[PDB]
Amino acid sequence: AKRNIKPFDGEKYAIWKFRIRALLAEQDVLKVVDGLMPNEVDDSWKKAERCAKSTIIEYLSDSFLNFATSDITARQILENLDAVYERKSLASQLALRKRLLSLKLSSEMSLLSHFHIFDELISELLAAGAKIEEMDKISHLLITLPSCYDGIITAIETLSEENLTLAFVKNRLLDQEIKIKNDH
Amino acid sequence: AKRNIKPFDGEKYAIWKFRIRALLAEQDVLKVVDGLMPNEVDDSWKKAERCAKSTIIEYLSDSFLNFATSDITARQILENLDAVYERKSLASQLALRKRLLSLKLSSEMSLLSHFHIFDELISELLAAGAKIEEMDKISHLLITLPSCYDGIITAIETLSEENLTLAFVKNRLLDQEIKIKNDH
Amino acid sequence: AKRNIKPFDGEKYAIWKFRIRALLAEQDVLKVVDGLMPNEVDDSWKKAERCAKSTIIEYLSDSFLNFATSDITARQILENLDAVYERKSLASQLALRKRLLSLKLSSEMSLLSHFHIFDELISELLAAGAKIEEMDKISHLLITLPSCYDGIITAIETLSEENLTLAFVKNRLLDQEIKIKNDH
Amino acid sequence: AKRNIKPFDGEKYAIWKFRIRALLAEQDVLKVVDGLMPNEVDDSWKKAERCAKSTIIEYLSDSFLNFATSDITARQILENLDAVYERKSLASQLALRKRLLSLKLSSEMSLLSHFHIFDELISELLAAGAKIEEMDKISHLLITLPSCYDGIITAIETLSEENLTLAFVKNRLLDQEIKIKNDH
Amino acid sequence: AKRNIKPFDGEKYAIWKFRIRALLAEQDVLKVVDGLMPNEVDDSWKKAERCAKSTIIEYLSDSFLNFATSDITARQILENLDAVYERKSLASQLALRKRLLSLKLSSEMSLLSHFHIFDELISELLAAGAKIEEMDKISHLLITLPSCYDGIITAIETLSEENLTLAFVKNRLLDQEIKIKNDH
Amino acid sequence: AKRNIKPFDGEKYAIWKFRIRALLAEQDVLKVVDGLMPNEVDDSWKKAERCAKSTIIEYLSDSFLNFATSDITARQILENLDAVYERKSLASQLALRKRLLSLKLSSEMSLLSHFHIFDELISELLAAGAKIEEMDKISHLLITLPSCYDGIITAIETLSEENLTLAFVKNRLLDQEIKIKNDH
């Protein structure tokens, strides 16, 4: 159905997995991957499993068929791909946190690309066994900015830590980005 | 279904949203986005929800999938996108007003491209939350023109401000642009 | 359906309009644009309106959607496009007559491309609002040719008016250039 | 359906008409073009007429849409195109005969390509209604050959004028061409 | 259906004929061309003949459409193309046999291009009415490779013969080439 | 249906066979290949056989059409292709082992890509009839790493050979890669 999914070439596994899961959810098949295996399986379950396996095999590049050649269901294929490409290791978290704690904003880059990079790093941390909530994301985003945003950083941190959301902080930062680009 | 929609890469959100809304209306699915949530859900409503969510996910770039990563409906995805990209802000509208006031037609550019740029700026300013009347758009268009159009700028302002539509002014400006190009 | 209709980008509006109308007629949707609005609208009429609007939006560039941005029917979109791009402006007619009269053939040119250029100029001129019959088209085409064609030009202008058509004249000119190219 | 059909740009009209007729016959729609118009029209006839007209418009270049701008059926479009193009002017027949009378075999061209070109010329001339006997075709083919085939020319002329066929002459010419290429 | 069939332009007629016959067998139409004229004014027979003619015409280039312009059955069209491009002539067969016997192999081209040339020569002999079996093909192939392949040529020729194919020999020769390239 | 299948040209036969089998299963046609032939054949079985043969032929290159020239079914084509290109021979697997020995890790390549290449080679070797135990896979993986992994290799070797799996070794090597890339 959806043909905007680039075949898995070993790069950007999160995006491919998300698009495959969305496409499966379109066809009322995502219950196979997530839902528990019923004690008795009927024709509908078999058809759903066949459709999920066919879709996953179709959206895998030629070199990656070996993840599906064996007699393994779609959920097993996704589990194997997740284990190979999204592994929960403390070393990965420790390596990624140092990059996240040293991610300054370059002058030539706008806050939209910087926000995209920061969100990519946060999602990569969350892929491993990390527990980062909204407040930690806000704190990292605030500490990953140059000195021109000191006023908004001081003002935002004074706000109560119960209604703060990442979108609100991002909008407040973009407003001062617009203000700052005028004063430089 | 319709592959003329450019994936949303953070630029020209109004066009992308309009195209997505039109595509959803074609499939008889737009009732998810705008129609009220029924008290009792059925198979048709769930199918429409899934189809709308899958279409929106299909027509988003790889960077913007975090708007749909959460288990939320297509209506909520569009609401979040509206709040993050079509929010009403005063600083942004002030910057757009400055850009409109500092907009000058270049010699190389033709009046059609200048009109397109002016309409884009007006649409962005209106989305930013600045109410603009037709006469304000007409005055901006008149003052954003070079000295070659001074005669027609003076002539147009003398007309009564009761049926002066932007289309008539644009047509007259094109007609005199033909004469201006004839004399160069 | 058909992808042979190039998206509208401000050039060759008549061809795009005709192809869009033909595509709408193929899907039995042209009654929306041409047929009178019924007093009571049913599911079929609104479905046809949605299909026409989606088709026109799909075959419009991202810069030309400002007309359709307002929630208005496709018939009004076509009417606005016609008013903007097919307007009875005398200055455009005069400029296109001046360009058409001074349209001498170049040495490095193919007469099929010359016919294409002449026909697009004529189509633009008719869009400008100046009616040109057949005889004027043949006269302009004949006067646009060099002196090497004088024999066939005189033979054609000596022929009867009833048998004189633009396509027949173009065929005669092709037959003559075959000899001209052979005789070199 | 068939994408092998080249859009009609004013050249080789017979090929385009044959391809379009075959495509229409594929969809069981050619009955509209060829069959008599029924006194009472139904939904099927209207759908077939719409499909035929839409296909003809789709497989027409931008320079020939004027043949379908008027509100006419596909039958009338094909009739007008036949009237304009399915007629051989005196100059066309004279040019065909001149090409036949001045046809020669080049060094780089093989005998298969030359035979194909000669057969194409004969087919085009017969399309104009010029009856040609087999001996005339044989004489034309023999005089269009170089001087390297004089031996087989002398051999062929000595055969009785009762069993001379074009196929036998072509086979003998190819057999001699094999030796001629060997004798170099 | 099958679009891998390239349009016939007087090149590699055997491949095109095989693909066309396979496509006709897909639609159960081969009875029209291979049957002993079981004509009994059947509607199914007429439909099959029309479908065969349409399929043959679709996969023919514009140059070669003169082979099917007349009202001849698909069997007659295939027979005419066979008589034109598969001519049983002993002189051509002898010349091609000389070409095979004096083939050898170059110093720069890989085994794949040499195999393609050998396949072209063998197919042209089979077109020329020469009866060649698998063993004859292997014997012709194995006398053209350089002395670097003698170690595998002797081993292949020493085998028990019986059930060995040209494809297996080609695979072994490609493996030997892979082993050779590491040294030379 | 799916045109993503590269036509077979003697390279990567397993991928081509898997894609062809998947496509046949999609069309409800694969039952002719795996399922037993019924004693009495009906029209449905004949249609499925025709579809399978035509689909296999369509995705065979012009060089490999000789595998289906004779009157054979899809099963015969697939079994002949298996016998020629999927046979379990010493020569088939010795080359694969010699390629595994020379799979040195490059500096620009991450261990994810190198692990994928090693897995592809191991799967190809398994398809070559050479059964490989887990420890052999681990040793083959370990001998392809540079001197930067000496410590982890020694630690792995000192481990007991009871529950040492390839996944555990790969995870340890990836953690060591993180540590190494940190130390540069």
Author numbering:
A (entry chain B), B (entry chain D), C (entry chain C), D (entry chain F), E (entry chain A), F (entry chain E): 3 to 186
What does the paper say about this structure?
Here, we show that the Ty1 retrotransposon Copia forms virus-like capsids in vivo and transfers between cells. Because Copia behaves in a viral-like manner, we used cryogenic-electron microscopy (cryo-EM) to determine the high-resolution structure of the Copia capsid and found that it is distinct from the related dArc1 capsid, with a larger internal capacity and the presence of pores similar to those used by retroviruses to carry out their reverse transcriptase activity.
To enhance the resolution of the capsid region, we used local reconstruction methods to determine the structures of individual subregions of capsid known as capsomers, which are sub-assemblies that are found at the vertices or faces of the icosahedron. Because the Copia capsid adopts T = 9 geometry, there are 2 different hexameric capsomers along the faces (a hexamer with local 3-fold symmetry and a non-symmetric hexamer) and local refinement of each hexamer provided high-resolution maps (overall resolution of the non-symmetric and 3-fold symmetric hexamers are ~3.5-Å and 3.4-Å overall resolution, respectively). The high-quality maps of the locally refined capsomers allowed us to build an atomic model of the Copiagag protein with high confidence and good stereochemistry. The NTDs form central spokes at the center of each capsomer sub-assembly, while the CTD is arranged in the capsomer periphery. (D) CopiaGag non-symmetric hexamer is colored by electrostatic potential. The positively charged (blue) pore is at the center of the hexamer. In place of the spikes, the Copia capsid contains positively charged pores at the center of each hexameric or pentameric sub-assembly, similar to HIV. The positively charged pores of HIV function as gates for dNTP entry into the capsid for fueling reverse transcriptase activity. We hypothesize that the pores in the Copia capsid play a similar role.
